[PDB]
């Protein structure tokens, strides 16, 4: 029957996850730079992490 | 000393006194830099959510003493402009002509141009209306006074400065104003009234050459 | 003289545009962005960026007095750009010429 | 999903329009995950109205048009995941 | 017992023209035979023309495609 | 998990639907969907400028009904 | 993937670049201003936008008669619920 | 990195070490702008970067003969521990504000490495100050806009 | 299905009104009340935004044009004071 | 945080405008409201008025308000003691 | 025979104009259509009630607002 070769029964996605591109999200940040510290420390020479 | 913000259309106008200049055996190295120095002062006297950031010199020689004056000021904008603004017409209108010549002390006389066009119309058209005026007024002084009451019968108020008519008044006196201003450029620029588009138009009330 | 024009968004365009308001690799383009941010999220400016950097490698910050320039003069610009004339017309019409 | 970057925002002072024009400004206490959003110390402003100040809000969270957030947000700690 | 879809199942069988009228725009309604649709009822249809009814107006329109949640009736 | 709306009731009744737009409808009912999307034989269009106009089988999207009332008792 | 190619490569080349949108919303203000964030239904959080919408004095005569001015407001930081946006625009 | 690494001219150390999750295939070392690269049959897991800063006399301000004599100094050292023998060594030249790299290359880390060189040496604020504290040395300036 | 819809499950077969999207409001006696606050309703008058009232035996409204529903205060002690 | 608002005197507002107050006992996930006690308004609502405080205002009882036209709620006073 | 997605895929890159609820038009070059039916239009001109107040560039429209879809 054609409406089944049409590939019936009227959909509403509501809920259901959508096929593609749809779900596109995208943040732009960009974080303060954690820089080391290297004068007067008390600490170890080598940096720390 | 004309201050002219486009925005809020209060004119910071400073007399400048006759003894300033009366005796002070000087050239135009303290003329310049004295402008300049006058108008730093009125930036230092305004607070600085009332402090511009952008300041428009008319004549090309005080954006340079501007540089010098504003070093206190490295936030703010000196550009030059290729569109002069007849502010020789606020001179003209008695109001402020005999306010600043019977001022007999220098001082800091505040104005808002447009008298309370702000909550009738935008800042832009305001501001194009206002050079309308004072365009007009400069290419002739009494026959755009005359324009400017379309009745003998309306009048401004003492704390106003231009009479008080509304949009369709207002309309009609803007097209008025505009081919007074048009009317008397090609009697004197050699050529006719119809040979120009609304930008040239627009330039030629503005003040920029074609 | 441009109306935002409803039903209509092109005019607010030619409203701020007047305004002035605007091996075998891979095989891709990366996006290099290297941006300077305080913990506000402010585009930091190279000078000030280079001292937040020399701050955490000398490990010593300002002191007080210049902080507390530093954060007034931020809510300086806080307050001037979430932004007299009114109660200049309202001082005309108790009685034109303010003079200071 | 950007909701969850509104119930990171926990006593945050921020002021609110809606679809009918009623601007809220108060500081945000639950955020669901259909923006469901909770206030206290509400000064709600009904427009063409005078506005009125009261101690709690819950909005329906499709009738919010925008957010106002304050100037002091840090908000590239707050929409990483 | 028959469907909706399974009216217009026998529609586009039918290929004959219908005129589909829109959530809540009263006078605005759109004449056209649809060529295919699926399940979100979003509607192809064939040489469309808006027709405003309070001036009696037919603006051609051509192969158009119209959204689901748009409409109100679709009358043969 | 759209259960169909309960109306073999209104099946082959004469009922006036009233659609969005303040607008109204008569017809027999011949079907439906879980959307309430109605099929309509006998179709009736009744506008507010009050001449009827028939049209027969007419489908009506579920989104715009507002009521049905059923003027064939059940 | 295909994060990059739909519909919503105007937010996703708009929020990578930083540029500035236009946004058409639904009430007829106009956003201008940096997309900091997107989502699926476009809830865009905005750094720095220009509400620009237009008024008239509303017969401040009595006798119905003025003209429409535009008015413009500045948002800091917003977080702009996409329901509202008829359309967005990146800038020529 | 040593306090001193920064200028720790004779032998070197490395900066930036990155794990794969995977092995890498990587590069035989050839310089930042070699756009013909032949790889070398080895697989890595962690990859080093070392920065190697220079002041360029005129003689030799060829920064891509420093990195490259760097390079295969340092790696071919014994005063200079490396995690791994693959990995690149940025040199810059201050003086001339140069760059290129010359070590192995893993896949998109040669265009990373050439897009963030660019936008590292336009936008350093540490070269920014470098930058205009030579301009204020030499009193030498630009015109305003 | 939440405790407002099994309220209105509960209200079946009882004197319920329902105030429309458009704003009608229709005074009768319910029949069905499903999950989506669809109502099949009885003995029922008609008030339009006219002011003007009608009556009808049944009417079936569309449950998301509803705009809300008087219900009967037989049910405000029971079933929901442990919610 | 609407567990902490059950039984309360609770001014719900509508996306029309007719505000109501009532006992707000059952909510849902859509926010669909079950309210005893509630009286509805349209025009003037009372700070304490120059004229009446309450005018324009109809008895309801108990409604199932959907959660389709519903906007915010507040709290007006305390529970009754029954 | 030709049923919505592939007519949307019959029309990414032809001019077509997409009219929405709220009677704007926008004629251009679509780029792309996704499940809900949002569209990306390029070199877009916004035609208010037939006649047009501007060129605009690059315009996502909401899937929300869309009337119909009609190639020119």
Redesign the interface.
């Known amino acids: 029957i054609e409406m089944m070769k049409l590939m019936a029964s009227f959909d509403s996605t509501k809920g259901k996850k959508v096929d593609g591109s749809v779900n596109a999200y995208a943040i732009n940040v960009s974080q303060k730079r954690k820089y080391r510290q290297y004068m007067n420390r008390k600490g170890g020479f080598n940096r720390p992490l | 000393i004309f201050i002219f913000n486009p925005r809020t259309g209060q004119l910071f106008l400073k007399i400048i006194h006759t003894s300033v200049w009366a005796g002070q055996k000087r050239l135009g190295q303290l003329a310049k830099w004295k402008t300049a120095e006058e108008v730093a002062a009125l930036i230092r006297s305004l607070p600085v959510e009332e402090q511009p950031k952008q300041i428009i010199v008319t004549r090309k020689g005080m954006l340079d003493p501007l540089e010098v004056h504003l070093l206190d000021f490295p936030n703010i904008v000196i550009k030059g402009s290729e569109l002069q603004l007849p502010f020789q017409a606020c001179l003209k209108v008695e109001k402020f002509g005999d306010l600043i010549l019977k001022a007999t002390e220098p001082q800091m006389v505040l104005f808002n141009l447009y008298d309370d066009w702000l909550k009738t119309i935008s800042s832009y058209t305001a501001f194009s209306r206002l050079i309308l005026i004072l365009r007009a007024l400069h290419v002739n002084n009494d026959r755009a006074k005359v324009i400017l009451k379309p009745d003998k019968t309306t009048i401004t108020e003492p704390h106003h400065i231009w009479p008080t008519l509304t949009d369709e008044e207002w309309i009609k006196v803007e097209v008025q104003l505009k081919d007074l201003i048009l009317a008397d450029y090609g009697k004197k620029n050699n050529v006719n009234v119809a040979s120009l588009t609304q930008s040239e138009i627009r330039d030629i009330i503005l003040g920029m050459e074609i | 003289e441009e109306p935002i024009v409803n039903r209509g968004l092109a005019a607010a365009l030619l409203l701020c545009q007047n305004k002035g308001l605007l091996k075998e690799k891979d095989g891709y383009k990366p996006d290099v962005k290297i941006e300077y941010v305080d913990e506000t999220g402010r585009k930091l400016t190279p000078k000030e960026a280079f001292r937040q950097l020399s701050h955490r490698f000398h490990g010593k910050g300002s002191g007080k007095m210049k902080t507390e320039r530093r954060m007034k003069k931020l809510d300086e610009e806080a307050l001037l750009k979430k932004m007299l004339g009114t109660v200049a017309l309202l001082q005309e019409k108790q009685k034109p010429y303010i003079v200071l | 999903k950007l909701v969850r970057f509104l119930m990171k925002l926990s006593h945050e002072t921020v002021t609110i329009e809606l679809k009918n024009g009623t601007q809220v400004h108060g500081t945000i206490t639950g955020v669901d995950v259909s923006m469901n959003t909770h206030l206290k110390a509400v000064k709600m402003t009904l427009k063409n109205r005078e506005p009125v100040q009261l101690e709690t809000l819950s909005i329906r969270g499709n009738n919010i048009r925008y957010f106002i957030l304050p100037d002091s947000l840090p908000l590239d700690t707050l929409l990483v995941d | 017992?028959?469907?909706?879809?399974?009216?217009?199942?026998r529609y586009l069988?039918n290929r004959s023209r219908i005129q589909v009228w829109?959530?809540?725009?009263?006078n605005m309604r759109?004449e056209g035979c649809i060529?295919?649709?699926?399940?979100?009822?979003?509607?192809?249809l064939d040489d469309?023309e808006e027709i405003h009814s309070k001036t009696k107006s037919r603006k051609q329109?051509?192969?158009?495609?119209?959204?689901?949640?748009?409409?109100?009736?679709?009358?043969? | 998990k759209a259960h169909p709306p309960e109306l073999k009731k209104f099946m082959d009744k004469k009922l006036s639907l009233k659609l969005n737009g303040g607008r109204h409808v008569q017809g027999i009912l011949r079907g439906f969907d879980p959307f309430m999307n109605l099929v309509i034989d006998e179709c009736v269009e009744m506008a507010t400028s009050g001449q009827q106009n028939n049209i027969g089988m007419v489908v009506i999207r579920g989104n715009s009904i507002i009521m049905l009332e059923a003027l064939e008792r059940v | 993937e295909e994060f990059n190619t739909g519909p919503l490569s105007v937010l996703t080349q708009s929020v990578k670049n930083n540029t500035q949108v236009l946004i058409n919303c639904r009430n007829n203000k106009k956003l201008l201003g940096r997309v900091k964030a997107f989502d699926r239904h476009c809830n865009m959080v905005l750094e720095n936008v220009k509400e620009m919408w237009t008024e008239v004095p509303k017969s401040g005569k009595g006798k119905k008669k003025s003209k429409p001015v535009n008015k413009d407001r500045y948002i800091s930081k917003m977080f702009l619920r996409g329901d509202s946006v008829i359309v967005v625009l990146r800038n020529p | 990195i040593h306090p001193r690494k920064s200028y720790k001219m004779n032998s070197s150390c490395a900066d930036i070490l990155l794990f794969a999750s995977y092995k890498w295939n990587v590069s035989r070392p050839s310089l930042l702008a070699d756009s013909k690269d032949v790889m070398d049959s080895t697989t890595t897991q962690k990859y080093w970067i070392d920065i190697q800063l220079r002041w360029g006399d005129y003689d030799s301000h060829d920064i891509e003969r420093y990195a490259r004599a760097k390079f295969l100094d340092y790696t071919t050292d014994n005063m200079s521990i490396y995690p791994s023998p693959t990995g690149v060594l940025i040199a810059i030249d201050l003086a001339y504000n140069l760059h290129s790299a010359y070590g192995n290359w893993f896949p998109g880390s040669k265009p990373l490495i050439q897009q963030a060189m660019a936008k590292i040496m336009k936008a350093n604020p540490a070269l920014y100050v470098l930058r205009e504290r030579i301009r204020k040395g030499l009193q030498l300036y630009s015109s305003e806009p | 299905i939440g405790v407002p819809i099994k309220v209105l499950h509960e209200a079946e077969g009882h004197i319920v009104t329902c105030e429309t999207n458009t704003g009608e409001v229709y005074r009768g006696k319910l029949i069905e009340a499903e999950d989506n606050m669809n109502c099949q309703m009885s003995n029922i008058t008609v008030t339009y935004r006219d002011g003007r009232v009608a009556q009808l035996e049944q009417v079936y409204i569309r449950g998301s044009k509803i705009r809300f529903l008087i219900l009967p205060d037989m049910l405000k002690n029971a079933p929901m004071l442990k919610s | 945080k609407m567990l902490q608002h059950i039984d309360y005197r609770m001014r719900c507002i509508l996306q029309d405008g007719r505000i109501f107050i009532g006992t707000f006992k059952a909510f849902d996930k859509h926010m669909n409201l079950i309210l005893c006690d509630c009286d509805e308004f349209r025009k003037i609502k009372p700070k304490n008025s120059k004229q009446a405080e309450r005018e324009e205002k109809r008895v309801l009882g108990l409604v199932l308000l959907r959660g389709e036209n519903l906007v915010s709620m507040t709290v007006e006073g305390p529970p009754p003691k029954d | 025979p030709l049923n919505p997605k592939p007519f949307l895929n019959g029309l990414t890159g032809k001019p077509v104009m997409v009219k929405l609820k709220w009677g704007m038009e926008y004629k251009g070059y679509l780029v792309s259509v996704d499940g809900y039916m949002n569209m990306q239009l390029a070199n877009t001109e916004e035609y208010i009630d037939g006649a047009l107040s501007g060129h605009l560039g690059e315009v996502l429209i909401r899937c929300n607002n869309v009337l119909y879809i009609r190639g020119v």
């Open positions: 017992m028959v469907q909706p879809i399974n009216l217009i199942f069988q829109l959530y809540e725009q009263v759109i060529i295919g649709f699926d399940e979100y009822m979003n509607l192809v469309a329109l051509g192969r158009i495609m119209l959204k689901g949640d748009n409409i109100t009736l679709l009358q043969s």
